[PDB]
Amino acid sequence: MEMEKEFEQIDKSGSWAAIYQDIRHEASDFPCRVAKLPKNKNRNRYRDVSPFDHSRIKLHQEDNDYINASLIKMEEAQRSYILTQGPLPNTCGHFWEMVWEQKSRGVVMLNRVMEKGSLKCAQYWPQKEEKEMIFEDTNLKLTLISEDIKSYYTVRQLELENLTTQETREILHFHYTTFPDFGVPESPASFLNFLFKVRESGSLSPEHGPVVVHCSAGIGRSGTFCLADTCLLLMDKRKDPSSVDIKKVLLEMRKFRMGLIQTADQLRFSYLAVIEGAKFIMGDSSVQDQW
């Protein structure tokens, strides 16, 4: 496959930094006026990571409709993702309101609450069955239903209830707990196994609203997850591991949210994942068992 030729030639000449810088230079720049309004300062985790106005998710409140979240709509792949920052202590209600209004079935969390000894995300889901959470501002109730903990990720079944209406929904929470503080995993196997666990759940499927994906800023690891998934989908649709250009798909996604893929490392790991994942896509269904 042509992607494996490119990977090996970029590696051979140690120009990943150069390739990645090129992507930074060519990436879209759109306005983020609403994110930057004074009233929204405390709704943003990082001053340098903002949703573009044109693709931002709007909350359906007439109060303040702002949340730091972007709709990434991949037209050809026929997949949509919402990428958002890790909820702040004051934005957990907004987060779950978005999940509700967007009709999402899955939340994919790619960070730990604490990394590098600092808090990266608020504790926005309940950790015990008997202690549900109520978000008074958005009138939603959230209850931990079950939790399946594996060595490198955890899946939880949550019940989200709209207290206004009393309709309830099941949300699946996919928590990848072993993406390293620095660098990236040496093997994409754990990551791919995770992604396919999300896929098998139905969470990425067209019957539902777009999956919600976040890490701390919602661009690095979040970008890696969506990039790999979309690339594998395009390869599957076309059955042509050669026609799928990962740098172009990445640039396409960056039309919808800035900064997707934060380091040359994450770029290289993205190639790694797509290359290894394409073995499964192309008819070798046994590679999933070895992941």
Curated annotation (Swiss-Prot):
<dbReference type="GO" id="GO:0008286">
    <property type="term" value="P:insulin receptor signaling pathway"/>
</dbReference>
<dbReference type="GO" id="GO:0035791">
    <property type="term" value="P:platelet-derived growth factor receptor-beta signaling pathway"/>
</dbReference>
<dbReference type="GO" id="GO:0030971">
    <property type="term" value="F:receptor tyrosine kinase binding"/>
</dbReference>
<dbReference type="GO" id="GO:0043507">
    <property type="term" value="P:positive regulation of JUN kinase activity"/>
</dbReference>
<dbReference type="GO" id="GO:0150052">
    <property type="term" value="P:regulation of postsynapse assembly"/>
</dbReference>
<keyword id="KW-0256">Endoplasmic reticulum</keyword>
<dbReference type="GO" id="GO:0008270">
    <property type="term" value="F:zinc ion binding"/>
</dbReference>
<feature type="binding site">
    <location>
        <position position="181"/>
    </location>
    <ligand>
        <name>substrate</name>
    </ligand>
</feature>
<feature type="modified residue" description="Phosphoserine; by CLK1 and CLK2">
    <location>
        <position position="243"/>
    </location>
</feature>
<feature type="binding site">
    <location>
        <position position="262"/>
    </location>
    <ligand>
        <name>substrate</name>
    </ligand>
</feature>
<dbReference type="GO" id="GO:0098794">
    <property type="term" value="C:postsynapse"/>
</dbReference>
<dbReference type="GO" id="GO:0036498">
    <property type="term" value="P:IRE1-mediated unfolded protein response"/>
</dbReference>
<dbReference type="GO" id="GO:0097706">
    <property type="term" value="P:vascular endothelial cell response to oscillatory fluid shear stress"/>
</dbReference>
<keyword id="KW-0007">Acetylation</keyword>
<feature type="domain" description="Tyrosine-protein phosphatase">
    <location>
        <begin position="3"/>
        <end position="277"/>
    </location>
</feature>
<dbReference type="GO" id="GO:0033157">
    <property type="term" value="P:regulation of intracellular protein transport"/>
</dbReference>
<dbReference type="GO" id="GO:0003723">
    <property type="term" value="F:RNA binding"/>
</dbReference>
<feature type="modified residue" description="Phosphoserine; by PKB/AKT1, CLK1 and CLK2">
    <location>
        <position position="50"/>
    </location>
</feature>
<dbReference type="GO" id="GO:0030968">
    <property type="term" value="P:endoplasmic reticulum unfolded protein response"/>
</dbReference>
<dbReference type="GO" id="GO:0005829">
    <property type="term" value="C:cytosol"/>
</dbReference>
<dbReference type="GO" id="GO:0097443">
    <property type="term" value="C:sorting endosome"/>
</dbReference>
<dbReference type="GO" id="GO:0098978">
    <property type="term" value="C:glutamatergic synapse"/>
</dbReference>
<dbReference type="GO" id="GO:0008285">
    <property type="term" value="P:negative regulation of cell population proliferation"/>
</dbReference>
<dbReference type="GO" id="GO:2000646">
    <property type="term" value="P:positive regulation of receptor catabolic process"/>
</dbReference>
<feature type="modified residue" description="N-acetylmethionine">
    <location>
        <position position="1"/>
    </location>
</feature>
<dbReference type="GO" id="GO:0010812">
    <property type="term" value="P:negative regulation of cell-substrate adhesion"/>
</dbReference>
<dbReference type="GO" id="GO:0004725">
    <property type="term" value="F:protein tyrosine phosphatase activity"/>
</dbReference>
<dbReference type="GO" id="GO:0043407">
    <property type="term" value="P:negative regulation of MAP kinase activity"/>
</dbReference>
<feature type="modified residue" description="S-nitrosocysteine; in reversibly inhibited form">
    <location>
        <position position="215"/>
    </location>
</feature>
<dbReference type="GO" id="GO:1904753">
    <property type="term" value="P:negative regulation of vascular associated smooth muscle cell migration"/>
</dbReference>
<keyword id="KW-0558">Oxidation</keyword>
<dbReference type="GO" id="GO:1990090">
    <property type="term" value="P:cellular response to nerve growth factor stimulus"/>
</dbReference>
<feature type="modified residue" description="Cysteine sulfinic acid (-SO2H); alternate">
    <location>
        <position position="215"/>
    </location>
</feature>
<feature type="active site" description="Phosphocysteine intermediate">
    <location>
        <position position="215"/>
    </location>
</feature>
<dbReference type="GO" id="GO:1902236">
    <property type="term" value="P:negative regulation of endoplasmic reticulum stress-induced intrinsic apoptotic signaling pathway"/>
</dbReference>
<feature type="modified residue" description="Phosphotyrosine; by EGFR">
    <location>
        <position position="66"/>
    </location>
</feature>
<dbReference type="GO" id="GO:0006470">
    <property type="term" value="P:protein dephosphorylation"/>
</dbReference>
<dbReference type="GO" id="GO:0044344">
    <property type="term" value="P:cellular response to fibroblast growth factor stimulus"/>
</dbReference>
<dbReference type="GO" id="GO:0019899">
    <property type="term" value="F:enzyme binding"/>
</dbReference>
<dbReference type="GO" id="GO:1902202">
    <property type="term" value="P:regulation of hepatocyte growth factor receptor signaling pathway"/>
</dbReference>
<dbReference type="GO" id="GO:0019901">
    <property type="term" value="F:protein kinase binding"/>
</dbReference>
<dbReference type="GO" id="GO:0010977">
    <property type="term" value="P:negative regulation of neuron projection development"/>
</dbReference>
